[PDB]
Amino acid sequence: MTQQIGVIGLAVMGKNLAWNIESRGYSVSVFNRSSEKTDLMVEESKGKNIHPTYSLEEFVNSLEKPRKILLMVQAGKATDATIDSLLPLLDDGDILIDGGNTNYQDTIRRNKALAQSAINFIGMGVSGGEIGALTGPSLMPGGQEEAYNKVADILDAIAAKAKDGASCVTYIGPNGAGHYVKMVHNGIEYADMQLIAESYAMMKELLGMSHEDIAQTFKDWNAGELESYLIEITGDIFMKLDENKEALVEKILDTAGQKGTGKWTSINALELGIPLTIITESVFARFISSIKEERVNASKELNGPKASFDGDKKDFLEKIRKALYMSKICSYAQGFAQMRKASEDNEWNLKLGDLAMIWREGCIIRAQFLQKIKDAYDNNPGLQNLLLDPYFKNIVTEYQDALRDVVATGVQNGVPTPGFSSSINYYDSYRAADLPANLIQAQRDYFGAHTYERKDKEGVFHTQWI
Amino acid sequence: MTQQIGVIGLAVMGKNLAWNIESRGYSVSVFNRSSEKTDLMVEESKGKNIHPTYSLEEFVNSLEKPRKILLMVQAGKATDATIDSLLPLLDDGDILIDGGNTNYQDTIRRNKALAQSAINFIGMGVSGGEIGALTGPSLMPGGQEEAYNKVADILDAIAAKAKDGASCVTYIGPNGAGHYVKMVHNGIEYADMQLIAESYAMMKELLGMSHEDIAQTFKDWNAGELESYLIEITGDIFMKLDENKEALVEKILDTAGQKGTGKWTSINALELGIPLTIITESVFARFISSIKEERVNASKELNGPKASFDGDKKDFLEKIRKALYMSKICSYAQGFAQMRKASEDNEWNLKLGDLAMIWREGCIIRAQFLQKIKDAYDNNPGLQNLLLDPYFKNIVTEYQDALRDVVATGVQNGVPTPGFSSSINYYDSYRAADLPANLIQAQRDYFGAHTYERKDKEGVFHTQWIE
Ligand SMILES: O=C(O)[C@H](O)[C@@H](O)[C@H](O)[C@H](O)COP(=O)(O)O
Ligand SMILES: O=C(O)[C@H](O)[C@@H](O)[C@H](O)[C@H](O)COP(=O)(O)O
């Protein structure tokens, strides 16, 4: 008479999640304010246990208590509009689940407001794309821990499974913790794609490699430690030829699009005081990407060196490979330092090892790399920074020679390497016992009387320099 | 019996500004809610036309109308609290001037709310420090234009005077444009200091020079095109001694303090879609400087190359100079691109040439470099980007060779150069006709079906990439 879970908003992401839930033996109610999308789902659901509803009242009354309602509607005001309409129809203990690409600060607000109406609110990050939602995504749910455990069985059944069987879902933390770490996953994803793009730019501009050799190189890289979904599809992309047997990717306009999640991570890092240089450079790299016609006009006015390489290209290709793997470690080390601080500031008590665990499959950044981050936190739960992990430390201690060679060669040949440059600069600053920040403190004391501390004496000092 | 202008908040900044005003022949009323500071300044103003008040009602009733009130109260709630209590006592046409380090969005809110009660509001950036506030600071007032004109004489009197005879103050724009431009100034200031810090880092760790040679180099640089207040005081700083013959700068804790305007500029750039890489790296550089204990522990676990240099040090030191000057050009170009975008979105109608004009003196980033920015916009008011100005373009055309050599050398010797690196990366990215964002777009279409556009034909496309 009543279904076990309900899904509002039946675009392709909501349709696929509901179908995923139904494929595991659960009964699902579906509703869409525009009932035409409900009418096509039912025809695409011949045989499936999908119960359509054509009103919020009928939808809510269709669900067993405590009601489990998954919100898969457009982010922003539509989500708040759907919440406000449901609130009069719900009963105490009902559970709302926002699976959209929501800013975590809105989730904090909705969770706080709804809780005063005795209503549970789970903001859940969902990663994996359209195909990921239909077969097994990465799921980052945050909110009331008790309400999570009441829906954990459903989430665990639909989530992607790692090679050790563990489902790629776990309780992240209170209120907005889930949507927060989904935002950080996307920020990490930005840097992964930009580092691949810089490897690609070096192979094309500096080495003059054809699209076939570019694809084969990424495939060879994918058979080793760099194995990842993004590197896999990068190999497939350079295989996709077009009308006249040319690389289709070479005819795509170089203007990188964006939703909020990219700039949101960088803004949050700045607010928290975390040096998220690599991801931020990637976000900034998308900004420069978008002013195409301005760059086209600047290319005719500003000259640079002509890229040339007189050495062994296969040896240098391997240096790019080392540079890519080391830059991932530096980028992830920054992203996990941000989550550690956000956990502390928001009192989320995050378990960073669990985040790497649920990112091993389902999500876009999924890679064997994620298993070694989990190994890092499994070996040392108090690990203060990824660079200090014994395995990762041994890598960057080795690969730094190739990363320096790759950056310096890119700079002398006019090939921009913002992600590579940021990684090596992060490694050199983080390991530096003494930075030139003492001169910054001396200047601020000069013109602003901002005082300073000393390296030998303890206390606060001010100096009349002139 | 009445005064011409009033100052609320008598810490050092509000004090010196009140004394600056009084030094020009104006009558100033002063107030501070904690009367401790008020009693002290009346002792410090023996013989000066300073009328002290000891209640908000007495303060307002002591000023001639339209009343001109300079608020120098702690930013945030204390400033909004002062406005809320002043409002019932004011009359239509009165003018409030907030001169603290205020987030421009707060100024937008206050201005529009107070406009509904016929109260003018001016958010004025103040740059120059305590001494600069006493003699002549840079002033960036934003608000109602006819409210600025009724106080323009006072501001022009107290502002620093460039050697054109022009004062370092202009009507910046409506509402929060004054505090916005002040915020970008501080963001630019962060980068100027980080670039100087990197230049110094290359001298100590790579070239092995000591404080004597480092100081004389910055003075040598300050005689040429790089002449700036910041580079000048750097040379002075590397000469202050421990009284045990040591350079005092070397035993200062390398944990850079920071306040809002630094990260505010980067956060704003990220909201506007502006590539502010150099200022942002400098903000991030201060963050990583703060975890000193985390760094000293990493210093014993993460090794790197032993910095060694064998070539001609004087040629390379000159290369560092060219690297510093070109990095400023890219950094300022990013900052002035941000301001151009911000005025477009806020209809502020900013005149960037006037900004560089009033930063020629009084402010912290003041330098002959800012005459060239003024000369750029005077040469081309529709300048797309400072890098396209013929003078700057010729500089970066030649200096890019040096900046590459410095960045490559520092990278090979483990000396971090985040400002130098992001500047040459900005140059190579801004001038790149074709960037590798085509691959990023292809990937976003692969896993997200976000679709893409093409270079040859036109329209929007989505592709089945794998079979
Ligand atoms: O599926 C995921 O892992 C992420 O959620 C990501 O795929 C996001 O949802 C968009 O697809 C890309 O976002 P941008 O437009 O910011 O690249
Ligand atoms: O006069 C100026 O230009 C500034 O107002 C200055 O006095 C301010 O104190 C710092 O430049 C801000 O930088 P911090 O955030 O490092 O203080």
Author numbering:
A (entry chain A): 1 to 466
B (entry chain B): 1 to 467
Give the exact sentences the study uses for this entry:
Two key enzymes, i.e., 6-phosphogluconolactonase (Pgl) and 6-phosphogluconate dehydrogenase (Gnd or 6PGDH), from oxPPP were identified as Ag+-binding proteins by LC-GE-ICP-MS. As the third enzyme in oxPPP, 6PGDH converts 6-phosphogluconate (6PG) to ribulose 5-phosphate (Ru5P) with the concomitant reduction of NADP+ to NADPH. Since oxPPP is the major NAPDH-generating pathway in S. aureus, we therefore further measured the NADPH/NADP+ ratio in S. aureus exposed to Ag+. With the recombinant 6PGDH, we show that Ag+ binds to 6PGDH and inhibits its activity in a non-competitive manner.
